[PDB]
Amino acid sequence: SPRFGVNYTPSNGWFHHWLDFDLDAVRADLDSVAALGFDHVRVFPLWPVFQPNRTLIRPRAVEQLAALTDAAGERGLDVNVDGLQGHLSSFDFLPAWTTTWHRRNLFTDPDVVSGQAEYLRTLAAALADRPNFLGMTVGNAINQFSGHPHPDPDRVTPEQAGDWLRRMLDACERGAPGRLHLHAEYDAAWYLDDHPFTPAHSARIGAVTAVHSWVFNGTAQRYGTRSTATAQHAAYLVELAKAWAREPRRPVWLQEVGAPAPHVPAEYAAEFATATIDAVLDCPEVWGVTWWCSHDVDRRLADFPELEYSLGLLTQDRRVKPAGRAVAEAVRRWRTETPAPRPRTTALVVDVGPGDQAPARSVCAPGGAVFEAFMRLTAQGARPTTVLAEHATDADHLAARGITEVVTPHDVH
Amino acid sequence: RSPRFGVNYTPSNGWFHHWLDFDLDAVRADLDSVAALGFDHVRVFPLWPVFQPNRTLIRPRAVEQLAALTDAAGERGLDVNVDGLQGHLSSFDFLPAWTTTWHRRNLFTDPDVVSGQAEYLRTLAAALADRPNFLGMTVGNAINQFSGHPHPDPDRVTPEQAGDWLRRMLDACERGAPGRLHLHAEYDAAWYLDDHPFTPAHSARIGAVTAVHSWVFNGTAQRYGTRSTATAQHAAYLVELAKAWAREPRRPVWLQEVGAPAPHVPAEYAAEFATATIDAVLDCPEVWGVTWWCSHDVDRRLADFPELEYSLGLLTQDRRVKPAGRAVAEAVRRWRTETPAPRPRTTALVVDVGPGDQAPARSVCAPGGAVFEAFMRLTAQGARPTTVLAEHATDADHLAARGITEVVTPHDVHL
Ligand SMILES: CC(=O)N[C@@H]1[C@@H](O)[C@H](O[C@@H]2O[C@H](CO)[C@@H](O)[C@H](O)[C@@H]2O)[C@@H](CO)O[C@H]1O
Numbered sequence: 018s019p020r021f022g023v024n025y026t027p028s029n030g031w032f033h034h035w036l037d038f039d040l041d042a043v044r045a046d047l048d049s050v051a052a053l054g055f056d057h058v059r060v061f062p063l064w065p066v067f068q069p070n071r072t073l074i075r076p077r078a079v080e081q082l083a084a085l086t087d088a089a090g091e092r093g094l095d096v097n098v099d100g101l102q103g104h105l106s107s108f109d110f111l112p113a114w115t116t117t118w119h120r121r122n123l124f125t126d127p128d129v130v131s132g133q134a135e136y137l138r139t140l141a142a143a144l145a146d147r148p149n150f151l152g153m154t155v156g157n158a159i160n161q162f163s164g165h166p167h168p169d170p171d172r173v174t175p176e177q178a179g180d181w182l183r184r185m186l187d188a189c190e191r192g193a194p195g196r197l198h199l200h201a202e203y204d205a206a207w208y209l210d211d212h213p214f215t216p217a218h219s220a221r222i223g224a225v226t227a228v229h230s231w232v233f234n235g236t237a238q239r240y241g242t243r244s245t246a247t248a249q250h251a252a253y254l255v256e257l258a259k260a261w262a263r264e265p266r267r268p269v270w271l272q273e274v275g276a277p278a279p280h281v282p283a284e285y286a287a288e289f290a291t292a293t294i295d296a297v298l299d300c301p302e303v304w305g306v307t308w309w310c311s312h313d314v315d316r317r318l319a320d321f322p323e324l325e326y327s328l329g330l331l332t333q334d335r336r337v338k339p340a341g342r343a344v345a346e347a348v349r350r351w352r353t354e355t356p357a358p359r360p361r362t363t364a365l366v367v368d369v370g371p372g373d374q375a376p377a378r379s380v381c382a383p384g385g386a387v388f389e390a391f392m393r394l395t396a397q398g399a400r401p402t403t404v405l406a407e408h409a410t411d412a413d414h415l416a417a418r419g420i421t422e423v424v425t426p427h428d429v430h
Numbered sequence: 431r432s433p434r435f436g437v438n439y440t441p442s443n444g445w446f447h448h449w450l451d452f453d454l455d456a457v458r459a460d461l462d463s464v465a466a467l468g469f470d471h472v473r474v475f476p477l478w479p480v481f482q483p484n485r486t487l488i489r490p491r492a493v494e495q496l497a498a499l500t501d502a503a504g505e506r507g508l509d510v511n512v513d514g515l516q517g518h519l520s521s522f523d524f525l526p527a528w529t530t531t532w533h534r535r536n537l538f539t540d541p542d543v544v545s546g547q548a549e550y551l552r553t554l555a556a557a558l559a560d561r562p563n564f565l566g567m568t569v570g571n572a573i574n575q576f577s578g579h580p581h582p583d584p585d586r587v588t589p590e591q592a593g594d595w596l597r598r599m600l601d602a603c604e605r606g607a608p609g610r611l612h613l614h615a616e617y618d619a620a621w622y623l624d625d626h627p628f629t630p631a632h633s634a635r636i637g638a639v640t641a642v643h644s645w646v647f648n649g650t651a652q653r654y655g656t657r658s659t660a661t662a663q664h665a666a667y668l669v670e671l672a673k674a675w676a677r678e679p680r681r682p683v684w685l686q687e688v689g690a691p692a693p694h695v696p697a698e699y700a701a702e703f704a705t706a707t708i709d710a711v712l713d714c715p716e717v718w719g720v721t722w723w724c725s726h727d728v729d730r731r732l733a734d735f736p737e738l739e740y741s742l743g744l745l746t747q748d749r750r751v752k753p754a755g756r757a758v759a760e761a762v763r764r765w766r767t768e769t770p771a772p773r774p775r776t777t778a779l780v781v782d783v784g785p786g787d788q789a790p791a792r793s794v795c796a797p798g799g800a801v802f803e804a805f806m807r808l809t810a811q812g813a814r815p816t817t818v819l820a821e822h823a824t825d826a827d828h829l830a831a832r833g834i835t836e837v838v839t840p841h842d843v844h845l
């Protein structure tokens with residue numbers, strides 16, 4: 018029931034390939050992905066290339082995306098499209114009509130927002146007749162523009178961020194009705210007290226909860242490369258995200274997971290990949306696992322943080338790397354041969370402060386009491402899920418999720 | 431040499447975003463309509479982030495599209511000046527992702543950004559060097575607007591750093607295309623804004639010719655009026671002002687931008703204004719050329735431009751000649767038919783912008799300033815003034831080399 022895919026980083030040109038779109042290079046990339054057994058790709062337009070002026074959405078760029086989508090479908094790959102990039106791999110791609118003389122908050126300016134909505138509706142409507150089109154993700158961790166540590170953020174309130182998300186997803190739904198439209202925020206949404214994108218936003222707006230699991234976020238540094246916390250980090254984000262859902266079986270999509278050097282050294286990447294995926298597949302209701310990323314980044318492109326270059330499952334010339342070989346069996350076995358995991362009946366209480374804005378959510382970050390209690394329960398074999406403090410004695414909430422035992426971080430010690 | 435006539439080329443289909451949907455036949459039709467008006471050159475604009483999307487990727491296809499544009503121009507008798515670092519165009523900043531936010535690195539001082547800019551300019555120049563109609567490079571369109579107030583987020587630099595950067599950029603242009611016409615082109619803050627890092631000395635002493643961009647929405651029309659002498663003579667003023675800082679007595683001054691922006695120049699007055707402006711400029715000797723901004727109106731289906739930008743063309747979106755396009759063409763035809771002799775300017779107004787080479791009091795040259803108003807009064811009186819720096823006001827060798835026999839101060843004119 019969990020699907021298996023990759024975040025597609027075009028080997029020739031990286032995301033700048035939209036400026037030199039080569040369908041045969043894309044076909045060869047997708048062939049090398051399909052050969053490892055994946056069933057979907059997550060793909061990335063570059064927003065200022067597609068919408069260089071607020072009222073110019075380039076039809077040729079839309080046609081190229083459709084051709085990419087059709088090429089993926091010929092190779093047995095479904096396609097999720099991320100709209101607003103926005104941020105990719107340390108670089109911000111911002112249209113000139115949003116910056117300096119035209120600086121206008123990405124989340125609140127009425128004209129920017131209507132321009133974003135028309136962009137997203139246009140992409141979704143163009144792919145709506147593709148059977149392998151899964152739906153849209155609003156944008157790749159667009160929440161990284163909304164506050165620190167961004168050097169120049171478009172600060173917003175949680176109320177403002179939620180309003181914006183609902184408008185963006187309405188546009189996706191109007192473009193492609195009935196498809197799988199979601200938003201996907203990086204882990205500040207679960208770990209930073211002040212951050213305006215909240216756990217509630219992730220679990221209650223959009224079709225599924227998307228989480229992006231990256232052990233350079235303090236996890237590998239604090240607990241160690243070969244620790245239980247590092248191996249279980251993706252499973253933790255999946256079970257943590259469930260605490261805020263209103264539907265007891267709302268799917269959680271592990272939409273990014275990668276093996277970043279030096280926190281996961283190259284010679285440990287395959288072992289880490291297998292352990293991380295084994296752990297997350299012991300979590301019920303996982304929509305899918307989508308590895309970051311398909312192909313190493315061309316070192317002929319300068320100024321990436323070193324870690325970005327070697328995140329591929331395939332080399333830049335499409336050779337299978339050790340983690341690619343590894344995943345291409347923690348997929349064949351995970352598919353077909355791995356039973357859906359049993360329910361997790363022990364829930365750890367998550368006290369994130371009252372209201373829906375999670376002002377104390379850093380207890381969930383690496384080093385926090387909720388994080389460490391979850392990892393302790395995990396090491397003990399308890400297979401924990403999570404429950405909000407507000408629901409810790411809510412018998413209807415617990416029964417709907419099959420939770421029979423509730424423990425606080427203090428109980429765990 | 432005699433003055434040249436040309437246009438700043440705004441592609442009618444796609445504007446400068448046409449690099450993303452490059453249509454050579456649309457460029458050819460655009461240039462056809464420009465050649466019909468009798469021009470002899472175009473100034474053309476790469477979009478820097480499209481040409482160099484990563485510091486170490488200068489896209490071969492963008493370079494080849496620029497060469498194809500240059501060839502289409504040469505066929506039509508249009509020589510080509512290429513501006514490199516845009517950078518700024520018509521109120522929009524086009525900055526590569528590798529210069530901003532997480533990668534914010536000063537455009538003028540960061541070692542890696544500056545090396546990237548030099549390789550980009552060298553690459554463009556080398557790729558066009560075999561084209562006989564390639565004039566040379568301009569470093570970038572008013573790149574000085576990134577360097578301080580009123581930019582909302584400037585990359586600050588000292589004047590010494592600005593001059594060093596310019597020399598490095600121009601050396602790269604020269605390595606790419608030896609012997610061609612390489613210059614830099616700064617907007618009027620270089621002449622008008624106290625403490626602005628790009629100075630009059632930089633414009634008149636670095637690069638092959640001095641480039642001035644004349645825009646009467648800079649306070650000139652607002653203070654003196656649309657139909658005033660100051661508004662009609664503003665471009666000739668910048669030409670003669672820029673001469674004060676030249677070391678060579680016959681260094682050409684290129685009026686590389688001049689346009690008719692509404693409502694400071696209403697559309698119904700644009701033709702009369704263009705005629706008056708060009709007549710005033712062509713009464714100035716050693717004008718390299720007049721380059722009108724711009725060839726084509728901007729498509730109003732493109733959002734968020736300041737209103738004035740859309741109707742700056744001499745030609746409409748569908749390539750029809752506008753009243754100002756007819757007026758400029760007639761001025762060009764008149765000059766080419768009569769080839770009037772240049773007339774020297776023997777009366778010089780003293781320009782005192784303070785001590786040193788950084789012009790700390792240059793605002794006397796701005797609209798409302800004592801030098802500005804004295805120049806316009808001498809002009810109205812028919813004295814045909816040039817300008818001379820205070821440090822040269824009694825330099826007999828400097829004055830004889832320019833044929834200046836009369837030197838007057840702003841207060842002299844006050845009387
Ligand atoms: C500025 C910076 O590098 N921020 C990073 C994000 O880029 C990163 O986003 C995801 O992680 C991969 C690997 O780093 C990156 O290539 C993609 O942008 C992807 O969307 C984020 C992950 O939590 O971590 C930030 O620190």
Ligand SMILES: CC(=O)N[C@@H]1[C@@H](O)[C@H](O[C@@H]2O[C@H](CO)[C@@H](O)[C@H](O)[C@@H]2O)[C@@H](CO)O[C@H]1O
Pocket residue numbers: 118518519520521522571572617618643645687689723736739
């Ligand atoms: C932010 C802003 O509008 N800055 C303008 C410059 O754009 C302008 O540059 C020149 O003027 C024309 C007409 O405005 C414009 O299309 C081009 O960018 C051109 O290079 C400059 C002129 O001095 O004035 C600034 O205020």
